[PDB]
Amino acid sequence: MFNNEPLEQIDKELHDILADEEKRQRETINLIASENLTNGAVRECLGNRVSNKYSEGYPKKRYYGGNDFIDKIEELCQKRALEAFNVSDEEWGVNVQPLSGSAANVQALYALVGVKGKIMGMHLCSGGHLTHGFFDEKKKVSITSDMFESKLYKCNSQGYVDLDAVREMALSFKPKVIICGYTSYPRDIDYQQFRQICDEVNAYLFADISHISSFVACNILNNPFLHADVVTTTTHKILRGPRSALIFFNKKRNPGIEQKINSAVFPSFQGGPHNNKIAAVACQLKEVHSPAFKEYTQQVLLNSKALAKALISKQIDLVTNGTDNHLIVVDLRKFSITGSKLQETCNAINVSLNKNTIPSDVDCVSPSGVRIGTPAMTTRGAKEKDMEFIADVLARAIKITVDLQEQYGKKLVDFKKGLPGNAQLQQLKQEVVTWAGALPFP
Amino acid sequence: MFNNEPLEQIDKELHDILADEEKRQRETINLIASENLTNGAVRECLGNRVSNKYSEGYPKKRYYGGNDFIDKIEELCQKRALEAFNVSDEEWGVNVQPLSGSAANVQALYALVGVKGKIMGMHLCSGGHLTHGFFDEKKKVSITSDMFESKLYKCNSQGYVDLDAVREMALSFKPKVIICGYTSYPRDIDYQQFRQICDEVNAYLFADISHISSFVACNILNNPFLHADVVTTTTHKILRGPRSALIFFNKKRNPGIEQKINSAVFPSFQGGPHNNKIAAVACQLKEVHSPAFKEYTQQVLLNSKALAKALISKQIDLVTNGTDNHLIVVDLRKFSITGSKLQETCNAINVSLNKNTIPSDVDCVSPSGVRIGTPAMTTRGAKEKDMEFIADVLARAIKITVDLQEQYGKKLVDFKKGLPGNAQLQQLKQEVVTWAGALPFP
Ligand SMILES: Cc1[nH]nc2c1[C@](c1cc(F)cc(N3CCC(C(=O)O)CC3)c1)(C(C)C)C(C#N)=C(N)O2
Ligand SMILES: Cc1[nH]nc2c1[C@](c1cc(F)cc(N3CCC(C(=O)O)CC3)c1)(C(C)C)C(C#N)=C(N)O2
Ligand SMILES: Cc1ncc(COP(=O)(O)O)c(CNCC(=O)O)c1O
Ligand SMILES: Cc1ncc(COP(=O)(O)O)c(CNCC(=O)O)c1O
Ligand SMILES: [Cl-]
């Protein structure tokens, strides 16, 4: 007693908007540092009938029966995960049930500290995530600043993590957890010095590696597993998996952590796991652990270094003057345009990026930079030589943005009126669509 | 720079387990009250490339650009939701971002009461959900009992909600929210009398209708939208959508609720929404609002009443002596077997059900009943006359369970030793597989 007609037949209205979405993705220079493109195999898993099954609990400790195959999938995902991140199953465990990165962080923090517990993270304005304790004078914006007592550390004027201020804050604040690993940080992290500060104050070391997970797994960047008590990561960014998250916990350093983390995920926070997610994550984690994927990850960094260099060669300033990873933050102050203005211009030419704070920005209102990243375009086959073109397009967007600002003014409302129909933007869009349009597309 | 090989090629190991899972679903009499089977169109949505897009924020208030088509999908889903539940967009709003039922409830509760806020819900042991404030002497099991201060009301000895006790408790406790709508409650709800208590103590009325959502939408059961401030529902049970959730809020009764609910979901709790989910929910909500789906929902109730009646005709006792909806709770006390024993026996014969507390149980260890429901089998094409066979199969499972208990003993460890190789079970399994395997399967 159901309708089995295809999506095109059953819901023509939705199938057209989805077909349009796919075409937009196909014809976009996607520089969102947190985005990627999943392969067909990952998307076969996400649409699999395995999502029909209620399987509350954990493998071999399920509430319901009929979970033999679901237990095999969840066991294969946890195993594949610990392997992918070069950790022994006797020393580290992994929870694979968190539905997204923010859920994973709230759950992991709750397990470590509980309600009213004290946490430290990087300020959002300096490159931290919302789930690292973000609040404002006007409000406790993230639940992580409200269910926990949080304190926020900043980067120095050059955009680097300032460990002297981290320590100064940690000694007087005395948090149970200190969070490192960031949303828009262009350099590698000195975990050892984080571990050194955590020991001193008897705080847990939390590493959120969502943005750099592939670099960690493939041993290109520093390894937080040598130092951290807890490692969280999303599976949908540079890792190129589905939208999901992983919580890692160090058993050897913290006996009893397994149960605290596991009970935090269920039944403290979540109900039934989404088994299609877990299948899809299992699938990508095999790819992640291959020499082929290490090559892709290496390519991400080569493109990023090359993109940084080309932008510098065109007299564009980068926060920290470069990058150790997949992402760059452009400092736009010398052109006197905001991040939001350039984001609007880039959207008009099918270039996807986001506005982003820089160190000099005291607030998150009027951020003076943008953030770009190479994983999505590296997935579509761009090599180092293609980064000149990406730099050229972004330079041209900055110039048009300055020109439009001159003509229509610095108020964002006025500025945008200059945008539609612009001859140069229509020209630049067409170049973007022509180049992007033809690149390999999963 | 990606592998586009199909799932079978790229990960043969995972593809076999998934093919096994699919076949197990095909050959099971699935009586899990909270389960269903999605159609192909909903699963096309879930495997769609729309999940590649980061779209933090709300439609037309997005952080990023390139969200024109994502904004169209999310607006379509919201519109389709409000129509499906027969409410005016002038008076009601809907948030479509919650990743699951449990997330939706924690988010919605936080919005209404905040950290340390006072909430009231049905005890888990009496049919409430975990996210309705569940705790135990030993521990605050749900975050809803830890981040909130919760009080728990029980059903009377006949299995009905006792409003006198609710009132007695509300007047003494003074909560900001009273939760009604349940996980294993076989009767309809007097929302009007819940509203009466809420008004009398100045508390919000929260209706979690995840289990009965189709009955509400199709005007078969009482309508909580006439009386409640907030209505949450999962989209994956009787509604037959993907794994996601919906928060409805009554603007007319509570000005400023829109922003409280919306900010709770993001950025208080979640990050980027899952666009494949939202698309998939959009797709199902169209079907939900059709005269054909009302017929399905009616069939769910006809099958349930007929199943209840056939079990009673075989001298099996039902909590509240019947049902007003899709689910039945069998009281097993007269056979001196636990729910866990029958669940084990039913898994051995490819019958999916779960153990469930009954009113006389003081603990959630050794529940004395099982819960069954008709949505999954109604989806597979079973009609009223097919319920006699289901009843016959369950009666035979109970008899075998009593006999096995006699032969091997009342300890669950000892009891299970009796199951493998049992001649009658293999026989009963084969009948189940033969009947189930034949039924229509989306
Ligand atoms: C969207 C999001 N999520 N997590 C993030 C961001 C970023 C971001 C950029 C921006 F322009 C604004 C905001 N805000 C989020 C909401 C917040 C509030 O509701 O009060 C106000 C500031 C966040 C960025 C990666 C897109 C950001 C930066 N910079 C950082 N560090 O992390
Ligand atoms: C699994 C789940 N989720 N939500 C639920 C359940 C049920 C359930 C049955 C059962 F036999 C046991 C439990 N527990 C959940 C965990 C809890 C703890 O960790 O302290 C112990 C008791 C829950 C049922 C629908 C399967 C249940 C009932 N009855 C109710 N009302 O709601
Ligand atoms: C460090 C970090 N942690 C957690 C998350 C949470 O992921 P979900 O959106 O899946 O909740 C993000 C996403 N940040 C968005 C971005 O960088 O564009 C992140 O950057
Ligand atoms: C009333 C109610 N509310 C919320 C949820 C949570 O849904 P998630 O599992 O999507 O978090 C459930 C699931 N209860 C499981 C069952 O009835 O079998 C439920 O019964
Ligand atoms: Cl999904």
From TrEMBL, chains A, B:
Its EC number is 2.1.2.1. It is an enzyme of class 2 (transferase). Residues 7-393 form the Serine hydroxymethyltransferase-like domain. The keyword Cell cycle does not apply. The modification N6-(pyridoxal phosphate)lysine is found at K237. One of its GO terms (cellular component) is mitochondrion. Pfam families: SHMT. Keywords: Methyltransferase, Pyridoxal phosphate, Transferase. One of its GO terms (molecular function) is pyridoxal phosphate binding. GO terms for biological process: glycine biosynthetic process from serine; methylation; tetrahydrofolate interconversion. It comes from the Eukaryota. Pathway: One-carbon metabolism; tetrahydrofolate interconversion. Its cofactor is pyridoxal 5'-phosphate. PANTHER family: SERINE HYDROXYMETHYLTRANSFERASE (PTHR11680), SERINE HYDROXYMETHYLTRANSFERASE 1 (PTHR11680:SF35). NCBIfam families: PRK00011.1. Belongs to the SHMT family. This is glycine hydroxymethyltransferase. It comes from Plasmodium vivax (malaria parasite P. vivax).
